[PDB]
Structure formats: C-alpha cells, structure tokens
A paper describes a structure:
Cytochrome P450 enzymes (P450s) are a superfamily of monooxygenases that utilize a cysteine thiolate–ligated heme moiety to perform a wide range of demanding oxidative transformations. Within GPA biosynthesis, P450s function in a specific, stepwise manner to install the essential side-chain crosslinks in the core peptide in a process that typically requires one Oxy enzyme per crosslink to be installed. Given the apparent preference for the unusual heme orientation shown by OxyA enzymes, we investigated the OxyA homolog from kistamicin biosynthesis (OxyAkis), which is an atypical GPA. Structural and biochemical analysis of OxyAkis has shown that this P450 enzyme is highly prone to oxidation and can display an atypical heme orientation in different protein batches.
With the general fold essentially unchanged, we performed a detailed analysis of the active site of this P450, which revealed a mixed population of heme orientations as seen in the Fo–Fc difference map electron density at the substituent vinyl and methyl groups. However, even once the density of the methyl/vinyl groups was well-explained by a mixture of heme orientations; there was still evidence for additional density at the side of the heme immediately below the I-helix (β-position). To explore the possibility of radiation damage to the heme due to long data collection causing this modification, we collected several datasets using an attenuated beam. Even with a beam attenuation of 95% and collecting data in small wedges to reduce possible damage, this dataset still showed density in the difference map for modification at the β-position of the heme.
Residue numbers in the entry: 5 to 66, 75 to 162, 181 to 384
The structure:
Amino acid sequence: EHRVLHLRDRLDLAAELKLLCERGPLVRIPLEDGSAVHWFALGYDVVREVLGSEKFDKRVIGALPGNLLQLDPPEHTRLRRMVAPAYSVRRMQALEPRVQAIVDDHLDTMASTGPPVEFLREVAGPMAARVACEFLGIPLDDRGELIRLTYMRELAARLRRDPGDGMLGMVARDHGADISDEELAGLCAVVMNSSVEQTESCLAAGTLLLLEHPEQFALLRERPELGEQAVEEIVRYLSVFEGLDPRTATEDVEIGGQVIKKGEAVFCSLLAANRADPALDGFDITRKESRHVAFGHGIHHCLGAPLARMELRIAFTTLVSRFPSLRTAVPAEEIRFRPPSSNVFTLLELPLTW
Ligand code: HEM
C-alpha cells in the first residue's frame, strides 16, 4: 500500500512522486473505503517533527524479540539502553582497523579474480556480512554458516554461555540475566539481515553513483578526507531505506500546521524528504553538511549509523584508491533496479570491469 512513495526514475524520483510532493510536506490521505485516515510526511522538517514527537507509537494497523523497531517506550528504552554502548565512539575506533582489513580482504579477492565481477553478490554482500560478524563478535567457525543462512536461538544461547568479543559478548556480559536467548538472537538477526541488506545496497548503488559522477570518483581519490562528507551525500541520494513503518498518533497532535487526530497513521518518506527539494539535490560530495534523514530521527534513530558510516567511509575511500580505472561493464542505463516496494531499495546486479 502507498506504492506511490517508492516510485523512482533509476536513482531519482519518478514524476508521479514529484507531483505528489508538490501537494505540500504533509498530505492527508483518507482511504477510499473510509476505514481510516492516513498521512504522508514528505518534507525534511515534517518528517523530523513526526519522528521526534512522543505522541506517536508503532502499533500494527489494518513480531520478534529483540526487534527494537517493534517496541515503544518504556520497553524500547530498556532494550536500547543495554545495546547502545556497543556503538560508542570508542567501540568504533577500536574496530576501524579490523574493518579496514576486512574491506581490504574483499578488494584483494576482487583484484585477483580479475575483471569482470558482479559487485553486489561477489564483493558488497560478503563485505557487509563479514563486517557484521566482526562487529557482533561471531566466532570464526560460525561465520561461514551464519552468513550462508542469511539456528539463531541455538547460536545465541551458546554465545551467551561463553561470552566473547563484539556486541553480543558485551551485552551478554553486562546484561546476562536481563536478556533472553530469543532476544539476543533477535538482536543478531536484525544486524545480519536488514542491516546487511541496507549496507550492501549502499555499497553497490553508492559505487554506481560514484561511477556516474567520475569527477567525484576521482575527487574522493585525490582527497580521501572527503570520505565522511561523501557518505552523508551518498546515503541521502540513495535513500535505500525509502519509507518508514507508520507512526500512529496516540492523541490529537499538531504537525506542520495540521491536526493529526488520535488513531491516524503517518507514513514518513525518507526518499521524498531527502530528494524532493530540487535546490541542492545534485550529488556533490564537497557539501560539508547534508540535510537528510536517511538514518531516521528520534528514539528509533538508526542504532547502527556509527558502524554504517564508518564501514561505508572505509569501503568507498579504499575502492576509488585501489581501482582508479573502475567502470561499469555495461551502460549504466541498463542496470536493473528493484521495482517499487517497501523492501530496501537496491539494484539487482552490478557488473563492473577495470
Ligand atoms: C551497520 C549497519 C546497520 C545496523 C547495525 C543497523 C541497526 C538498526 C537498528 C538496531 C535499528 C532499530 C532502531 C530503533 O528502533 O531503535 C535500525 C532501524 C533503521 N536503520 Fe538500520 N542499521 C544498519 C544499516 C542502516 C543503514 C546503512 C541505514 C541508512 C539508510 C539504516 C537506516 C535505518 C533507519 C532509518 C532506521 C529506523 C527505521 C524507523 O524509524 O522506522 N540502517 N537499524
């Protein structure tokens, strides 16, 4: 439902979706059957206003333990507080060199296998999955099978008995009794499944985006210090996480000048908020600060953004440096993108040569 919020022209918005955004940053959508009233939050400020408000929950409208996205306060707060330290700046700094080496491992395989390569399946996917295992602290003997399968309750209970390194070891060590096997397995699942999906798509589609702007491909090679800026601009432009689960108002609340009634559901379009403003939409990695909501906002703000930002920075900076002659093996116009859907936005394959 609301398929219009996912209509794209390759990487850009479809004219049908652009026309919808012209109806204002907040659009009232009464269902034809009269069963409910829905809202589209299409603007940067409105999306942030909706997602920051405490007067919305994430009820199901007309469930896995450890899935933070399906919890509201106070239970959401309880679980997020236990896992949040795994993403501290000190955690990411200690992890960076090991992530760099994993990225280098996969670009080593790439340069040795020789061209061409299907970048999505053969590089981006394995890279994101391997970085995920390292962050989680998966034992090396389990990573091969854990990746192929994406068992979990079995893996979670065992690691919980003998806590090791990574996020799962930290949680089990500091909150052993407060988190169950199923909840710990759920934390690991979200990281290995949706998180990898979104990260691998940024790696692949982001590479294509850089290739379609060769002046910036080289610029990031000349000036690797733009990496952090480039990541923000890439996730903004891609918007692989296009739309969010509905937020239902728990009471009458005024948003963007209009009154959202209790019980009405609001659908935030990160795609539209990140891309609808033609002024300053061009892809430009020299932008020192991007206006985007690709990682969400509020209490549900992407808990893995620190890892995602670091992994993508390392991946893109090392890629342009080790493969300055990189190019699509087919005309970029022939790349296939997944048809509109609530699923993560991604291309179907990315054949590359160099
Ligand atoms: C390092 C890889 C990633 C990890 C570990 C990760 C972990 C999560 C977690 C734990 C949540 C739940 C937050 C909560 O409800 O409290 C989440 C939701 C989200 N993630 Fe991912 N994520 C990852 C890659 C991404 C990337 C690359 C993006 C950017 C497109 C992303 C955009 C989101 C957004 C926007 C939400 C919030 C959805 C909503 O508000 O309904 N994530 N992620």
